Amino acid sequence: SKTVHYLKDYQTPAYHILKTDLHFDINEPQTVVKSRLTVEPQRVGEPLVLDGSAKLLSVKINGAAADYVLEGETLTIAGVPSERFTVEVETEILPAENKSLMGLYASGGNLFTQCEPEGFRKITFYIDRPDVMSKFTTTIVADKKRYPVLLSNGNKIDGGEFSDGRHWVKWEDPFSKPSYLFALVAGDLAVTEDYFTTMSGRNVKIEFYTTEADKPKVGFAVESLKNAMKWDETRFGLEYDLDIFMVVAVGDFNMGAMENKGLNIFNTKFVLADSRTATDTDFEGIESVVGHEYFHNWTGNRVTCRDWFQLSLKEGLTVFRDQEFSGDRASRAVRRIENIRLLRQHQFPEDAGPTAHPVRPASYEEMNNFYTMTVYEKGAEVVRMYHTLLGEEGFQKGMKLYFQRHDGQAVTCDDFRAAMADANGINLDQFALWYSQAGTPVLEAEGRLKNNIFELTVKQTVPPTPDMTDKQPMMIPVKVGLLNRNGEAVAFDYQGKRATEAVLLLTEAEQTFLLEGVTEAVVPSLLRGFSAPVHLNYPYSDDDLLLLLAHDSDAFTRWEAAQTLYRRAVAANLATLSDGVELPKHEKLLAAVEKVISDDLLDNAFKALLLGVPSEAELWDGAENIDPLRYHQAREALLDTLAVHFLPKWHELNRQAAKQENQSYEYSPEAAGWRTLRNVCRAFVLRADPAHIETVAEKYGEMAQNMTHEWGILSAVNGNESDTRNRLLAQFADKFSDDALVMDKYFALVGSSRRSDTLQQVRTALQHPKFSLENPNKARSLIGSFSRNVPHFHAEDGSGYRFIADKVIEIDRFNPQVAARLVQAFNLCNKLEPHRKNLVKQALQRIRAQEGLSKDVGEIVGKILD
Numbered sequence: 001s002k003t004v005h006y007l008k009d010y011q012t013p014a015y016h017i018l019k020t021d022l023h024f025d026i027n028e029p030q031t032v033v034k035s036r037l038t039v040e041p042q043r044v045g046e047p048l049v050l051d052g053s054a055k056l057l058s059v060k061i062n063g064a065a066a067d068y069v070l071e072g073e074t075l076t077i078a079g080v081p082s083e084r085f086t087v088e089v090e091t092e093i094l095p096a097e098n099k100s101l102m103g104l105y106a107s108g109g110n111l112f113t114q115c116e117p118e119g120f121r122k123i124t125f126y127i128d129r130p131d132v133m134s135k136f137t138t139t140i141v142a143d144k145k146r147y148p149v150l151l152s153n154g155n156k157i158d159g160g161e162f163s164d165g166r167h168w169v170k171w172e173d174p175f176s177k178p179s180y181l182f183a184l185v186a187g188d189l190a191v192t193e194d195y196f197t198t199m200s201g202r203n204v205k206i207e208f209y210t211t212e213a214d215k216p217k218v219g220f221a222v223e224s225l226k227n228a229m230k231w232d233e234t235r236f237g238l239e240y241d242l243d244i245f246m247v248v249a250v251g252d253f254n255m256g257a258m259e260n261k262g263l264n265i266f267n268t269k270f271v272l273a274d275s276r277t278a279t280d281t282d283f284e285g286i287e288s289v290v291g292h293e294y295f296h297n298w299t300g301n302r303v304t305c306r307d308w309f310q311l312s313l314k315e316g317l318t319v320f321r322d323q324e325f326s327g328d329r330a331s332r333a334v335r336r337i338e339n340i341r342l343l344r345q346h347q348f349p350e351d352a353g354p355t356a357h358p359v360r361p362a363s364y365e366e367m368n369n370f371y372t373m374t375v376y377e378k379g380a381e382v383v384r385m386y387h388t389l390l391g392e393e394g395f396q397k398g399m400k401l402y403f404q405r406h407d408g409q410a411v412t413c414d415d416f417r418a419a420m421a422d423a424n425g426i427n428l429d430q431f432a433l434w435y436s437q438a439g440t441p442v443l444e445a446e447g448r449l450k451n452n453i454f455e456l457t458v459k460q461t462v463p464p465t466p467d468m469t470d471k472q473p474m475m476i477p478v479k480v481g482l483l484n485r486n487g488e489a490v491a492f493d494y495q496g497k498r499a500t501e502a503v504l505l506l507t508e509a510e511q512t513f514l515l516e517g518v519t520e521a522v523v524p525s526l527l528r529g530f531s532a533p534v535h536l537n538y539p540y541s542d543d544d545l546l547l548l549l550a551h552d553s554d555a556f557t558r559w560e561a562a563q564t565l566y567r568r569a570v571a572a573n574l575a576t577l578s579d580g581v582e583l584p585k586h587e588k589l590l591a592a593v594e595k596v597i598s599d600d601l602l603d604n605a606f607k608a609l610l611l612g613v614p615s616e617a618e619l620w621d622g623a624e625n626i627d628p629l630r631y632h633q634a635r636e637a638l639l640d641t642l643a644v645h646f647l648p649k650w651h652e653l654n655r656q657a658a659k660q661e662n663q664s665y666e667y668s669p670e671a672a673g674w675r676t677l678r679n680v681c682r683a684f685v686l687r688a689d690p691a692h693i694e695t696v697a698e699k700y701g702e703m704a705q706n707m708t709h710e711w712g713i714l715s716a717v718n719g720n721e722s723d724t725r726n727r728l729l730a731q732f733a734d735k736f737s738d739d740a741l742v743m744d745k746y747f748a749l750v751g752s753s754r755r756s757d758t759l760q761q762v763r764t765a766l767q768h769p770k771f772s773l774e775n776p777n778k779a780r781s782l783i784g785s786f787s788r789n790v791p792h793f794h795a796e797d798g799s800g801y802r803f804i805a806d807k808v809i810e811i812d813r814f815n816p817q818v819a820a821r822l823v824q825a826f827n828l829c830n831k832l833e834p835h836r837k838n839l840v841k842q843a844l845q846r847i848r849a850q851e852g853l854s855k856d857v858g859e860i861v862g863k864i865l866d
């Protein structure tokens with residue numbers, strides 16, 4: 001009987017912890033942790049149960065050796081006082097042996113922590129659940145020369161020196177917090193200092209800690225933080241609440257970053273950049289993630305989660321906030337489409353697959369398996385629907401009441417929903433289903449103009465998922481407009497208002513919406529701004545789609561029209577390839593693309609999106625008995641056709657873009673848009689004319705004016721069977737051998753190549769001196785990329801499956817989190833054609849047969865196999 005955790009079983013804790021006093025004595029190799037916990041009975045007389053997995057040296061209750069039992073990862077004391085009492089725990093840790101990167105661990109000769117969700121119990125024995133909030137004071141003692149920088153949450157209130165070369169510090173964090181927000185750093189790190197003055201007039205000292213060599217790359221992150229601090233004030237009315245804000249970069253880290261109170265810890269990938277070594281996308285990522293972690297100070301820290309089932313309470317909302325921040329900075333419509341594309345490419349397959357779950361899960365075995373596209377990105381779409389239904393002003397009324405009610409509390413998704421409802425005086429009961437029902441809703445829509453009424457009928461359905469069969473009608477906002485035969489906006493009457501746009505609120509299984517006062521023939525524009533996270537089916541002709549693409553006023557619906565045209569073209573390719581005949585002409589598609597190419601009024605980055613073809617996973621959505629190589633072949637044929645058909649115009653557009661970039665090689669949204677278009681053109685050019693690689697190689701130094709250009713060119717040639725591709729990659733690795741984030745790029749190119757020899761190049765790269773399997777960035781770059789490399793992962797001989805299964809098994813021995821993400825490469829199992837399905841099931845059974853397989857990987861494998 002494995003342990004499953006159920007949301008229905010939630011009970012308030014028997015004990016609170018009012019004060020948490022910690023002492024870290026850092027030595028070589030061991031660190032000894034001492035605690036003093038001030039414990040307050042809630043249900044008097046129950047046993048005290050503490051979570052913990054660190055080596056236990058001693059435990060006391062009010063200063064006397066406790067009578068306790070340690071079983072598994074729980075410490076229990078039966079005899080506890082009926083009033084306030086203390087518990088003192090002594091544990092010992094070997095951080096350099098901690099390759100899980102959870103708890104207290106070594107990286108680069110320094111010490112770091114990661115406690116979310118349940119890592120604090122790897123440091124000491126504790127009531128390690130987020131509804132237990134305590135006031136932390138942390139003392140740290142270490143060798144001064146080896147560990148001159150000693151940090152923990154909050155305010156530094158004392159410190160000093162010892163005559164043996166050791167020194168110490170004491171940090172007090174005055175805001176009661178759950179254990180998952182604890183952090184400690186001890187190291188030889190360089191500091192970059194700055195400050196921000198809050199709107200109430202208080203300076204906040206900003207400190208970024210990096211390696212000495214990395215310091216010159218942290219400046220954009222600092223600027224981004226100051227931008228995020230100002231934005232939370234101007235957009236949400238939220239001010240920071242300490243006079244110190246620390247950010248620490250670490251090269252070994254499971255995820256992107258972590259919002260520990262006043263002491264955020266970041267993957268280097270999301271804090272370090274310069275134009276020589278980071279792409280524009282990398283800069284955008286730093287801006288997004290620095291914003292994200294700062295926004296958590298209110299949405300996550302000041303108001304936290306009652307239990308881990310409520311994770312989206314903080315993550316969906318903080319993602320919405322980071323999206324809005326980025327959109328307010330620049331390029332809102334393009335960035336919105338990027339977010340939608342990410343959701344459909346990665347979250348929609350999750351909701352269609354064996355690991356599908358609601359935004360608020362009802363159960364889990366291992367909580368680290370639920371830091372998902374669903375909880376984050378669908379979670380953010382759910383928050384955004386409040387904004388769509390209520391408007392910005394109403395949304396901010398909800399936010400204000402949320403903090404009024406729940407500042408200092410650990411609360412639920414329901415509480416956020418109630419604040420939105422109550423602040424605006426409306427009923428959002430049906431909205432709750434966005435949290436409890438998994439799966440992507442499918443809307444079927446039909447339209448007719450009768451009299452002068454456009455009647456839009458819309459049906460909704462939500463498929464069963466493995467957790468739940470019954471799915472009731474949901475509250476689904478559908479933003480619409482109407483175009484006449486010349487693509488002009490057409491007004492209409494709805495709920496006693498004449499406008500060119502309206503939000504139709506679908507709440508029943510099937511409804512008809514009457515758009516009245518329509519005096520011209522129309523084609524509707526539907527789901528504007530991607531107004532709900534759904535699949536929408538409407539009968540559009542190719543000519544309707546061309547109209548929408550050419551003339552609609554909404555970015556998403558224009559882009560979705562192009563996407564539909566590409567999808568239909570791939571489907572036509574599939575049919576001809578299957579019937580063994582000539583490829584289709586795609587005459588209408590090609591006319592549409594020529595128009596996009598030649599339109600000088602189109603925003604550059606938007607034009608780039610209109611020229612992107614949906615991924616293989618998008619293309620086989622909803623299919624059974626999938627042969628991934630047949631979809632790959634149909635998609636590649638389309639790209640080949642686009643590349644060759646328009647080769648001169650790809651060169652021409654590249655030149656236009658280069659001229660407009662105007663040698664402005666530093667990061668800016670404007671220059672970046674031109675580079676994005678430039679890199680689309682390069683990809684098409686080198687597909688049509690692979691020999692152009694020698695021309696690029698001859699002038700490489702001249703083209704390599706920043707990393708966006710180097711990455712764009714290497715990406716464009718990465719599938720080229722020329723030896724020059726291999727030489728350019730080798731030269732790249734040599735040039736940048738000292739920059740670990742650039743080496744990640746090298747390994748991603750190795751892993752992602754559609755060349756025939758990628759598996760053996762990947763196996764050589766495993767032994768590259770700069771590769772480390774125990775580093776998540778490296779493992780994700782090489783092995784993760786390979787697992788997403790459709791022709792290689794899904795090779796008919798099963799070599800891709802065997803390779804990835806081998807690496808899941810190996811990585812799980814030291815980092816179950818990385819292994820459990822990797823093993824989801826197999827999630828398509830039950831939808832594959834029989835030969836591959838058989839091989840994937842063999843691979844999964846072999847993983848399952850491993851002695852000592854983690855709960856993390858076992859939970860995923862069980863969902864796929866069983």
Ligand SMILES: NCc1ccc(C[C@@H](CP(=O)(O)[C@@H](N)CCc2ccccc2)C(=O)O)cc1
Pocket residue numbers: 155174175176198202203204240241242243244408
């Ligand atoms: N309601 C329970 C609670 C609330 C707030 C706290 C927080 C503590 C924080 P603190 O003592 O370090 C205060 N001096 C910081 C003021 C400031 C703000 C912004 C910029 C610069 C300086 C408090 O402000 O008292 C602690 C507990």
Ligand SMILES: NCc1ccc(C[C@H](CP(=O)(O)[C@@H](N)CCc2ccccc2)C(=O)O)cc1
Pocket residue numbers: 114116117254255256257258259288289292293296315319322323371376
């Ligand atoms: N624009 C979308 C977006 C999504 C997420 C982010 C940031 C996100 C980090 P996060 O703030 O959610 C953090 N609470 C994850 C916990 C964790 C950390 C390490 C190990 C286990 C658990 C990331 O990982 O990047 C930032 C932006």
Ligand SMILES: [Zn+2]
Pocket residue numbers: 292296314315318
């Ligand atoms: Zn987050």
